[PDB]
Structure formats: C-alpha cells, structure tokens
Amino acid sequence: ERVAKLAGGVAVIKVGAATEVEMKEKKARVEDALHATRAAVEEGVVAGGGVALIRVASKLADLRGQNEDQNVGIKVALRAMEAPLRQIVLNCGEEPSVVANTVKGGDGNYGYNAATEEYGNMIDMGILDPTKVTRSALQYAASVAGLMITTECMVTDLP
Amino acid sequence: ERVAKLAGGVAVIKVGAATEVEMKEKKARVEDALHATRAAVEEGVVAGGGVALIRVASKLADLRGQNEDQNVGIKVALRAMEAPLRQIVLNCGEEPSVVANTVKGGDGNYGYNAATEEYGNMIDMGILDPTKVTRSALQYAASVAGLMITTECMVTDLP
Question: Where does the chain bind ATP (chains A, B)?
Fold first, then answer.
C-alpha cells in the first residue's frame, strides 16, 4: 500500500449499479476479477473452459505409481480433471461427454466456447483462466478429497 | 379375391421345441412375428437400434406449424424420436447422449450396435426393425400422449 503511495501510484475502481442488490453482486465480481488477475500476474494464463486441465490429463496418460492401487489413484485424478469442462457444458443444457470427446480430439488451446456454442482456439477467443487459480483449484481439491477417501470411521454427536 | 382364397390351400406350421413351455412359448412369438410381417409386407424394414427414428427427426428439422406453440409441439415429438436409441444405450450401462451425438453425426443407416459395442451400417449388421412396427409404435404413442398432455382436470373415486 505504502509502496504504491510512493511509486508508482494508487487506484480506485468505483462500481456503478442502479439498485443495491445489483451493487453487491457487481462489486463482488470486480473484487473477484481483481484477485484473479493478481494471481495470473504472479503465476500467467492458460486456456480457459477447463481445457488446460483436459490437456494435462492426456500428457499424464502414461504416469504410473509404485503399485496397481496407486495407478487407479492416478486415473482417478486424471478423470476428475475433465470435470470443470464437463460441468460448464452441463450448465448450458448440452451433452457434456460429446463436447469432451471433441475437445479431447483436438490439441493445444483448442476448446469449446460455451458462450457462443462453437469450438476454437481459447486464447484467441479471449477465454483465459489465470494459472495460479487453475493450479490452486487443483491442489486444494486434491488435498481435501485425498484425505476424505481414506475415511473408515466417523465420530459425531447424537441427533 | 375369391379365387385366391379358394385355390390355393392353407399352409401350416408346427412350432418345435424341447419343453412344452418353450414349445407353446415359442409358438407365441411366432404368431407375433407373422403379424408384423404381413403388415411389414403390406406397407418392409428400416435401420434398427432406433436409428430410423433419429433419421426422420433430422429430416423434419425444418417442419413448422401455424404458430409458436405448434412449433414447440413439433420439437417435442422430434426430441422424443431419439428416446428408443437413448434407452437402448442406457440399458447397456453406457452414456446415452454420447452415443446419440455420434449417431446423429452420421448418415443413412449408420448406427450403434449395442450387442457388439461398435458403430456401423445397421442393415449390413443385420439389425433391422420392420417398418410397420416402427411406424405403429410412433402413431400410437403419439395418439395417447397427445391427448394426455391436454389434461386440466381429473375425476376419480375417493381413496
């Protein structure tokens, strides 16, 4: 904060809306974007639409572990890596597996543009997620769900 | 017509079988088939796997009615025409929308062979439904469900 006061400078974004329920959801989105850009800057961008994830899943098609159970454990994460793309499509009322099949038929930054309903190069269409966020999504989900599946017993209060 | 009936004799069939159950059971299926056949003859075969229906749905992609409600009414039947294929696939434990997407990507008699789990030409693979049956399925379902959706009030006995 002090470095900006001295350096460079300090900027304020003022959000406009007609009402107050609008003000709140809008201010919340600008706050969200403000963070996501700060993350991209410290950690770049990758193809959005969750294609980045689908792309790393095919790169790791040949990853193996110390034994067969570890292998299924890998295939479990890879298969999960498809889910963001799969939900995005499902929220559009469209066939999620059919979109996924055809994105997985492509290469590099080829993806589905859910807004316009046609395939293309995601970076060219301006659909970029920041790397830090995609990474962070993955690391954290993995961390919790990893633990979660090792649960054999649960202890809680009575109803 | 009187000559044809008379000169002419009557052909008979004796359904052979191991068990009296199967026997009389098989006998049944026979009389059935015979039916459809006579009918099939009077008015043939079409690609099974419910592809015929999926095929007519794309031919009618440009059908319209007297007003917008009539239009939705058309899209409602077309969308339904996909259901047999969709159930067949769902009974195999496989992704029904993914199969449908790829059959709809094809043409003519290209379909899914649920038995062998691979796509191909349905007539070549011997998967044929008789026309009279496919037609008749459609006409009757339409007839009842058509009426059914116009229901605003129901009158029955007390529980």
Answer: 49, 113-115, 129
Chain B residue numbers with beta carbons less than 8 Å from the beta carbon of A95 are: 97-98, 100-101
Query: Obtained via which technique?
Result: cryo-EM
Is A137 known to sit in a ligand binding site? no
- The C-alpha atoms of residue B57 and residue B75 are separated, in whole angstroms, by 9
B109 annotated ligand binder:
no
Interface test with A, best of B79, B90, B95 (most A CBs within 10 A): B95
Residues of A112-139 as b/e, b for ≥16 C-beta within 10 angstroms? bbbeeeebbebbebebbbbbbbbeeebe
Q: Smallest Cα–Cα separation from A101: which of A70, A43, A58, A69?
A: A58
C-beta of residue A101 within 8 angstroms of C-beta of residue A16: no
Give me the sign of the Cα torsion angle B29, B34, B37, B42: negative
* DSSP calls for A120-146: EETTTTT-EEEHHHHHHHHHHHHHHHH
Resolution of this structure in Å = 8.2
Q: How far is B102 from chain A (nearest CA, A)?
A: 8
The H or E element containing residue A28 is: helix A21-42
Comparing CA positions, the residue from A14, A40, A44, A37 lying closest to residue A26 is A14
Query: In angstroms, what CA-CA distances link B88 with A2, B32, B92, B114, B115?
Result: 67, 22, 7, 7, 10
Q: Do A97 and B100 touch (CB under 8 A)?
A: no
